[PDB]
PDB file of all heavy atoms in Angstrom:
ATOM      1  N   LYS A  43      -3.208 -12.501   2.552  1.00  0.00           N
ATOM      2  CA  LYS A  43      -2.408 -13.621   2.062  1.00  0.00           C
ATOM      3  C   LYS A  43      -1.913 -13.351   0.594  1.00  0.00           C
ATOM      4  O   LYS A  43      -0.911 -13.939   0.215  1.00  0.00           O
ATOM      5  CB  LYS A  43      -3.208 -14.913   2.175  1.00  0.00           C
ATOM      6  CG  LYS A  43      -2.908 -15.581   3.537  1.00  0.00           C
ATOM      7  CD  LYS A  43      -1.712 -16.510   3.423  1.00  0.00           C
ATOM      8  CE  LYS A  43      -1.246 -17.017   4.797  1.00  0.00           C
ATOM      9  NZ  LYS A  43      -0.497 -15.997   5.556  1.00  0.00           N
ATOM     10  N   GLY A  44      -2.582 -12.480  -0.149  1.00  0.00           N
ATOM     11  CA  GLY A  44      -2.086 -11.959  -1.419  1.00  0.00           C
ATOM     12  C   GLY A  44      -3.215 -11.770  -2.447  1.00  0.00           C
ATOM     13  O   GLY A  44      -3.223 -10.774  -3.204  1.00  0.00           O
ATOM     14  N   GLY A  45      -4.154 -12.706  -2.483  1.00  0.00           N
ATOM     15  CA  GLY A  45      -5.357 -12.628  -3.275  1.00  0.00           C
ATOM     16  C   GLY A  45      -5.205 -13.061  -4.718  1.00  0.00           C
ATOM     17  O   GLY A  45      -4.101 -13.270  -5.218  1.00  0.00           O
ATOM     18  N   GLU A  46      -6.348 -13.159  -5.446  1.00  0.00           N
ATOM     19  CA  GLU A  46      -6.430 -13.628  -6.803  1.00  0.00           C
ATOM     20  C   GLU A  46      -7.684 -13.033  -7.487  1.00  0.00           C
ATOM     21  O   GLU A  46      -8.785 -13.155  -6.961  1.00  0.00           O
ATOM     22  CB  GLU A  46      -6.533 -15.140  -6.806  1.00  0.00           C
ATOM     23  CG  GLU A  46      -6.722 -15.757  -8.203  1.00  0.00           C
ATOM     24  CD  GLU A  46      -6.380 -17.251  -8.149  1.00  0.00           C
ATOM     25  OE1 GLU A  46      -5.195 -17.586  -8.325  1.00  0.00           O
ATOM     26  OE2 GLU A  46      -7.346 -18.063  -7.989  1.00  0.00           O
ATOM     27  N   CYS A  47      -7.461 -12.452  -8.646  1.00  0.00           N
ATOM     28  CA  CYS A  47      -8.512 -12.166  -9.620  1.00  0.00           C
ATOM     29  C   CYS A  47      -8.717 -13.377 -10.537  1.00  0.00           C
ATOM     30  O   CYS A  47      -7.758 -13.871 -11.138  1.00  0.00           O
ATOM     31  CB  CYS A  47      -8.110 -10.926 -10.494  1.00  0.00           C
ATOM     32  SG  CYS A  47      -8.345  -9.347  -9.618  1.00  0.00           S
ATOM     33  N   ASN A  48      -9.979 -13.831 -10.673  1.00  0.00           N
ATOM     34  CA  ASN A  48     -10.444 -14.794 -11.657  1.00  0.00           C
ATOM     35  C   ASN A  48     -11.681 -14.259 -12.371  1.00  0.00           C
ATOM     36  O   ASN A  48     -12.347 -13.360 -11.821  1.00  0.00           O
ATOM     37  CB  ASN A  48     -10.672 -16.139 -10.955  1.00  0.00           C
ATOM     38  CG  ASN A  48      -9.536 -17.151 -11.259  1.00  0.00           C
ATOM     39  OD1 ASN A  48      -9.762 -18.157 -11.922  1.00  0.00           O
ATOM     40  ND2 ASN A  48      -8.332 -16.897 -10.715  1.00  0.00           N
ATOM     41  N   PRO A  49     -12.043 -14.755 -13.538  1.00  0.00           N
ATOM     42  CA  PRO A  49     -13.040 -14.222 -14.404  1.00  0.00           C
ATOM     43  C   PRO A  49     -14.458 -14.289 -13.800  1.00  0.00           C
ATOM     44  O   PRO A  49     -14.705 -15.072 -12.871  1.00  0.00           O
ATOM     45  CB  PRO A  49     -12.967 -15.012 -15.737  1.00  0.00           C
ATOM     46  CG  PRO A  49     -12.311 -16.323 -15.323  1.00  0.00           C
ATOM     47  CD  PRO A  49     -11.375 -15.888 -14.185  1.00  0.00           C
ATOM     48  N   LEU A  50     -15.359 -13.446 -14.304  1.00  0.00           N
ATOM     49  CA  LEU A  50     -16.786 -13.422 -13.935  1.00  0.00           C
ATOM     50  C   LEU A  50     -17.483 -14.739 -14.236  1.00  0.00           C
ATOM     51  O   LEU A  50     -18.511 -15.047 -13.638  1.00  0.00           O
ATOM     52  CB  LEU A  50     -17.482 -12.270 -14.648  1.00  0.00           C
ATOM     53  CG  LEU A  50     -17.071 -10.852 -14.197  1.00  0.00           C
ATOM     54  CD1 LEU A  50     -17.636  -9.788 -15.154  1.00  0.00           C
ATOM     55  CD2 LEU A  50     -17.542 -10.571 -12.760  1.00  0.00           C
ATOM     56  N   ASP A  51     -16.934 -15.565 -15.152  1.00  0.00           N
ATOM     57  CA  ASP A  51     -17.431 -16.881 -15.500  1.00  0.00           C
ATOM     58  C   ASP A  51     -17.213 -17.889 -14.387  1.00  0.00           C
ATOM     59  O   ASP A  51     -17.963 -18.869 -14.276  1.00  0.00           O
ATOM     60  CB  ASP A  51     -16.673 -17.372 -16.776  1.00  0.00           C
ATOM     61  CG  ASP A  51     -17.062 -16.636 -18.057  1.00  0.00           C
ATOM     62  OD1 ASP A  51     -17.066 -15.393 -18.062  1.00  0.00           O
ATOM     63  OD2 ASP A  51     -17.358 -17.364 -19.025  1.00  0.00           O
ATOM     64  N   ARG A  52     -16.153 -17.691 -13.531  1.00  0.00           N
ATOM     65  CA  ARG A  52     -15.738 -18.608 -12.463  1.00  0.00           C
ATOM     66  C   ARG A  52     -16.310 -18.118 -11.129  1.00  0.00           C
ATOM     67  O   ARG A  52     -15.889 -17.049 -10.621  1.00  0.00           O
ATOM     68  CB  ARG A  52     -14.231 -18.771 -12.450  1.00  0.00           C
ATOM     69  CG  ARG A  52     -13.837 -20.192 -11.902  1.00  0.00           C
ATOM     70  CD  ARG A  52     -12.369 -20.504 -12.159  1.00  0.00           C
ATOM     71  NE  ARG A  52     -12.080 -20.738 -13.594  1.00  0.00           N
ATOM     72  CZ  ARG A  52     -12.282 -21.859 -14.284  1.00  0.00           C
ATOM     73  NH1 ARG A  52     -12.786 -22.947 -13.678  1.00  0.00           N
ATOM     74  NH2 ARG A  52     -11.933 -21.913 -15.560  1.00  0.00           N
ATOM     75  N   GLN A  53     -17.262 -18.861 -10.583  1.00  0.00           N
ATOM     76  CA  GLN A  53     -17.916 -18.591  -9.314  1.00  0.00           C
ATOM     77  C   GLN A  53     -16.953 -18.892  -8.147  1.00  0.00           C
ATOM     78  O   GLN A  53     -16.551 -20.031  -7.995  1.00  0.00           O
ATOM     79  CB  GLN A  53     -19.214 -19.396  -9.222  1.00  0.00           C
ATOM     80  CG  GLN A  53     -20.245 -18.972 -10.260  1.00  0.00           C
ATOM     81  CD  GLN A  53     -21.617 -19.639 -10.016  1.00  0.00           C
ATOM     82  OE1 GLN A  53     -22.396 -19.133  -9.181  1.00  0.00           O
ATOM     83  NE2 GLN A  53     -21.943 -20.717 -10.725  1.00  0.00           N
ATOM     84  N   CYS A  54     -16.606 -17.868  -7.379  1.00  0.00           N
ATOM     85  CA  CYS A  54     -15.573 -17.910  -6.364  1.00  0.00           C
ATOM     86  C   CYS A  54     -15.971 -17.051  -5.157  1.00  0.00           C
ATOM     87  O   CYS A  54     -16.629 -17.532  -4.241  1.00  0.00           O
ATOM     88  CB  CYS A  54     -14.247 -17.549  -7.031  1.00  0.00           C
ATOM     89  SG  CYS A  54     -12.770 -17.602  -6.010  1.00  0.00           S
ATOM     90  N   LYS A  55     -15.569 -15.767  -5.132  1.00  0.00           N
ATOM     91  CA  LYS A  55     -15.820 -14.784  -4.100  1.00  0.00           C
ATOM     92  C   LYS A  55     -15.777 -13.393  -4.664  1.00  0.00           C
ATOM     93  O   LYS A  55     -15.190 -13.139  -5.711  1.00  0.00           O
ATOM     94  CB  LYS A  55     -14.759 -14.959  -2.999  1.00  0.00           C
ATOM     95  CG  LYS A  55     -15.172 -14.337  -1.627  1.00  0.00           C
ATOM     96  CD  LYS A  55     -14.146 -14.721  -0.530  1.00  0.00           C
ATOM     97  CE  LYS A  55     -12.815 -13.922  -0.633  1.00  0.00           C
ATOM     98  NZ  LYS A  55     -12.997 -12.546  -0.101  1.00  0.00           N
TER      99      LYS A  55
END
Side-chain angles (χ1 to χ4, degrees):
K43 270 272 171 284
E46 176 164 274
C47 282
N48 257 246
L50 291 170
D51 290 50
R52 210 167 289 278
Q53 295 190 81
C54 183
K55 199 173 76 78

